[PDB]
Design a protein around this motif. Structure first.
Motif, short mmCIF file in Angstrom:
data_model
loop_
_atom_site.label_atom_id
_atom_site.label_comp_id
_atom_site.label_asym_id
_atom_site.label_seq_id
_atom_site.Cartn_x
_atom_site.Cartn_y
_atom_site.Cartn_z
N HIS A 160 0.83 -1.20 0.00
CA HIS A 160 0.00 0.00 0.00
C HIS A 160 0.87 1.26 0.00
O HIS A 160 2.06 1.22 0.33
CB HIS A 160 -0.97 -0.08 1.14
CG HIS A 160 -2.04 1.00 1.19
ND1 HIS A 160 -2.72 1.44 0.07
CD2 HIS A 160 -2.54 1.70 2.23
CE1 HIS A 160 -3.61 2.36 0.44
NE2 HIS A 160 -3.48 2.57 1.73
N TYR A 255 15.70 1.24 0.99
CA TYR A 255 14.65 0.79 0.07
C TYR A 255 14.88 -0.71 -0.25
O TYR A 255 15.35 -1.08 -1.33
CB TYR A 255 14.65 1.69 -1.20
CG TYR A 255 13.36 1.68 -1.99
CD1 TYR A 255 12.45 0.63 -1.93
CD2 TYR A 255 13.11 2.73 -2.84
CE1 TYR A 255 11.30 0.65 -2.68
CE2 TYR A 255 11.95 2.76 -3.59
CZ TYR A 255 11.03 1.72 -3.47
OH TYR A 255 9.90 1.70 -4.28
N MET A 301 11.52 -13.12 0.67
CA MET A 301 10.86 -13.71 -0.48
C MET A 301 11.66 -13.53 -1.75
O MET A 301 11.73 -14.50 -2.50
CB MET A 301 9.46 -13.13 -0.73
CG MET A 301 8.53 -13.53 0.34
SD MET A 301 7.93 -15.17 0.10
CE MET A 301 6.58 -15.20 1.30
N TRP A 320 12.62 -18.97 3.17
CA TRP A 320 11.18 -19.02 3.51
C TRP A 320 10.96 -19.18 5.01
O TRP A 320 10.01 -18.58 5.55
CB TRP A 320 10.49 -20.14 2.75
CG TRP A 320 10.27 -19.86 1.29
CD1 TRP A 320 9.83 -18.71 0.73
CD2 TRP A 320 10.52 -20.75 0.20
NE1 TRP A 320 9.71 -18.85 -0.60
CE2 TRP A 320 10.15 -20.08 -0.97
CE3 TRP A 320 10.93 -22.08 0.12
CZ2 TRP A 320 10.24 -20.67 -2.25
CZ3 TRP A 320 11.05 -22.65 -1.13
CH2 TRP A 320 10.71 -21.95 -2.29
N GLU A 345 0.77 -19.91 -1.59
CA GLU A 345 1.41 -20.37 -2.84
C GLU A 345 2.75 -21.02 -2.49
O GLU A 345 3.07 -22.06 -3.07
CB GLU A 345 1.55 -19.24 -3.82
CG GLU A 345 0.17 -18.78 -4.35
CD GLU A 345 0.21 -17.62 -5.36
OE1 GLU A 345 1.31 -17.31 -5.88
OE2 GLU A 345 -0.87 -17.03 -5.65
C1 3XW Z 1 9.92 -11.26 -5.88
C2 3XW Z 1 8.63 -11.70 -5.60
C3 3XW Z 1 7.54 -10.91 -5.98
C4 3XW Z 1 7.75 -9.68 -6.67
N1 3XW Z 1 7.14 -8.44 -6.10
C5 3XW Z 1 7.89 -8.08 -4.90
C6 3XW Z 1 7.27 -6.85 -4.30
C7 3XW Z 1 7.46 -5.62 -5.18
N2 3XW Z 1 6.78 -4.45 -4.56
C8 3XW Z 1 7.31 -3.21 -4.44
N3 3XW Z 1 8.54 -2.98 -4.92
C9 3XW Z 1 9.13 -1.72 -4.81
N4 3XW Z 1 8.39 -0.71 -4.21
C10 3XW Z 1 7.18 -0.99 -3.72
S1 3XW Z 1 6.19 -0.01 -2.93
C11 3XW Z 1 5.02 -1.02 -2.77
C12 3XW Z 1 3.70 -0.68 -2.11
C13 3XW Z 1 2.73 0.05 -3.14
F1 3XW Z 1 2.57 -0.72 -4.22
F2 3XW Z 1 3.27 1.21 -3.50
F3 3XW Z 1 1.55 0.26 -2.57
C14 3XW Z 1 5.35 -2.20 -3.27
C15 3XW Z 1 6.60 -2.22 -3.83
C16 3XW Z 1 6.86 -5.97 -6.55
C17 3XW Z 1 7.37 -7.35 -7.05
C18 3XW Z 1 6.27 -11.40 -5.70
C19 3XW Z 1 6.16 -12.62 -5.04
C20 3XW Z 1 7.24 -13.34 -4.69
C21 3XW Z 1 8.47 -12.88 -4.97
C22 3XW Z 1 9.34 -13.80 -4.51
C23 3XW Z 1 8.64 -14.81 -3.96
C24 3XW Z 1 9.13 -15.93 -3.36
N5 3XW Z 1 9.47 -16.79 -2.90
N6 3XW Z 1 7.37 -14.52 -4.08
C25 3XW Z 1 6.33 -15.40 -3.56
C26 3XW Z 1 5.78 -16.42 -4.54
C27 3XW Z 1 6.40 -17.41 -5.12
N7 3XW Z 1 5.45 -17.97 -5.86
N8 3XW Z 1 4.40 -17.42 -5.76
C28 3XW Z 1 4.52 -16.40 -4.92
#
Ligand code: 3XW
Length: 467
Positions: A160, A255, A301, A320, A345
């Motif tokens: 958020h 960050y 993660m 994990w 997941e």
């Molecule tokens: C790397 C990764 C992601 C990628 N996701 C990580 C979080 C990133 N979010 C962000 N990255 C930089 N700045 C901000 S600011 C913010 C809050 C708002 F969106 F502004 F409201 C979010 C966010 C966007 C990309 C998502 C799920 C993930 C992983 C790594 C795993 C592991 N293990 N997972 C869990 C998963 C594995 N399979 N299925 C889920």
């Protein structure tokens, strides 16, 4: 202004020209968020949304960018009258912040798909009247900067965004929506959410951006996706170069998620002479430990996902387990569903698939297998322990019988002679959760008692009557 010195690098004819603009802006007292987001959304539009006519790089002419910038400042100056909201002490008021939020909100198209790619930037706001959730928050901050409101800054959790403002930057205000079918809290503080210990507000250990961190946010927000199968190499390169610029200047220090993004980009295409993805994941984690009381889940993660993709089962399980050790000190609240989905997941899809492959490889003779390592069994147990501890005291439950079938399967992947080597202390492991403490004897039997495990994990009182 735009000011003359902001105009000298135009036209922007390449990735490196965009990087020079960001460098020049970051060297200024206050980088211009409106300019920078317009430039990024312009180039993203012509590299990812509509590549017709592309031959190398979409040249950003000053005349084009300055006209978009004028449309933004005209809309904000015309609709937000500052004299109605006197700045007591050179800081902004809650009413002023709410007004800017209302102006952005009321400019948006009545109906559109909020989950779409490429609606994050002020280029999307101006040309499409569309923003995503956090794009609205960013736009409120950009608008306030254009108005001279130096105290209004972007606040970010892991799912958020909102703003901070006012005396000592101590006030919080909701400015955008969260999720889908949640009820709006625009204009309110985030203190109730902090007080309830939800993941969404990170127990108050959220990011309070300065202007340079707001730049890092827009750069993380670049979306190279052209479609489900295809990324823009030009955008990947731009995002990577801009993230390194920021890193060198010190602006990713606080960050964590940006450091993970950078690590993921380096894994895809390493930059010679730079830190490895692993080093960067670890810096992300260190940032979280240093600045945020080690209360963030995604740094672990990001690391776990790397190890997963590289089929490093031991190290993925460890990461994990670490994700769970963070989550255990939260209450699972209304509006935390995204982190529930991530844990679900991992537990019920990713780990089972990893261990299925490890089982096949063990049958084929692997040595050093996670499945023969009691420390890996311990990591698996610690992961479940943290999840069970999360659930304790929470206003909504986490576990249910759907999780139990996968736990029994996963435990079963380790032979009893391996499982028996973990020592559970009241390879050595201490359980924090009452669920896992009750499970301890079941965890070491040569034959896993599936029904007893199910009963213990879901605290289901009874078995079937008939039969
Ligand atoms: C790397 C990764 C992601 C990628 N996701 C990580 C979080 C990133 N979010 C962000 N990255 C930089 N700045 C901000 S600011 C913010 C809050 C708002 F969106 F502004 F409201 C979010 C966010 C966007 C990309 C998502 C799920 C993930 C992983 C790594 C795993 C592991 N293990 N997972 C869990 C998963 C594995 N399979 N299925 C889920």
């Amino acid at each position: 202004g735009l000011k003359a010195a902001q105009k000298t690098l135009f036209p922007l004819r390449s990735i490196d020209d965009v990087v020079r603009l960001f460098a020049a802006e970051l060297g200024r007292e206050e980088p211009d968020l409106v300019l920078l987001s317009l430039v990024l959304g312009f180039v993203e539009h012509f590299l990812a949304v509509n590549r017709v006519g592309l031959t190398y790089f979409p040249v950003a002419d000053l005349s084009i960018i300055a006209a978009l910038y004028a449309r933004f400042t005209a809309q904000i100056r015309g609709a937000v009258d500052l004299s109605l909201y006197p700045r007591e002490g050179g800081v902004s008021s809650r009413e002023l912040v709410k007004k800017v939020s209302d102006v952005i909100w009321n400019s948006l198209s009545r109906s559109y798909f909020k989950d779409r790619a490429h609606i994050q930037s002020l280029f999307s706001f101006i040309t499409g009247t569309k923003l995503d959730s956090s794009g609205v928050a960013f736009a409120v901050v950009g608008a306030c900067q254009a108005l001279g409101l130096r105290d209004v800054h972007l606040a970010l959790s892991e799912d958020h965004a909102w703003v901070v403002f006012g005396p000592n930057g101590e006030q919080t205000a909701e400015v955008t929506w969260h999720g889908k079918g949640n009820e709006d809290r625009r204009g309110q503080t985030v203190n109730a959410g902090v007080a309830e210990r939800s993941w969404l507000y990170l127990k108050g250990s959220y990011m309070r951006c300065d202007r340079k961190m707001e730049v890092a946010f827009m750069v993380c927000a670049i979306n190279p996706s052209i479609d489900l199968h295809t990324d823009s190499l030009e955008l990947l390169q731009l995002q990577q170069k801009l993230l390194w610029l920021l890193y060198d200047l010190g602006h990713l220090e606080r960050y964590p998620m940006a450091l993970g993004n950078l690590a993921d980009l380096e894994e895809l295409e390493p930059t010679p002479g730079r830190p490895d993805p692993l080093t960067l994941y670890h810096k992300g984690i260190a940032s979280a430990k240093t600045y945020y009381r080690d209360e963030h889940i995604y740094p672990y993660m990001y690391l776990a996902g790397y190890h997963c993709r590289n089929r490093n089962v031991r190290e993925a399980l460890q990461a994990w387990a670490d994700t769970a050790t963070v989550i255990q000190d939260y209450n699972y609240c209304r509006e935390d569903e995204e982190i529930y989905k991530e844990f679900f997941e991992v537990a019920n899809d990713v780990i089972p698939n990893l261990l299925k492959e490890a089982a096949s490889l063990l049958e084929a003779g692997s040595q050093g297998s996670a499945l023969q390592d009691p420390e890996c069994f311990a990591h698996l147990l610690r992961f479940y322990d943290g999840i069970c501890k999360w659930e304790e005291g929470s206003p909504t439950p986490v576990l249910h019988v759907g999780w139990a079938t996968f736990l029994v399967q996963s435990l079963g992947r380790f032979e009893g002679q391996v499982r028996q080597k973990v020592r559970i202390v009241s390879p050595v492991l201490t359980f924090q959760s009452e669920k896992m403490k009750g499970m301890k004897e079941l965890l070491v039997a040569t034959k896993i008692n599936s029904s007893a495990i199910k009963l213990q994990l879901t605290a289901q009182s009874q078995v079937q009557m008939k039969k």
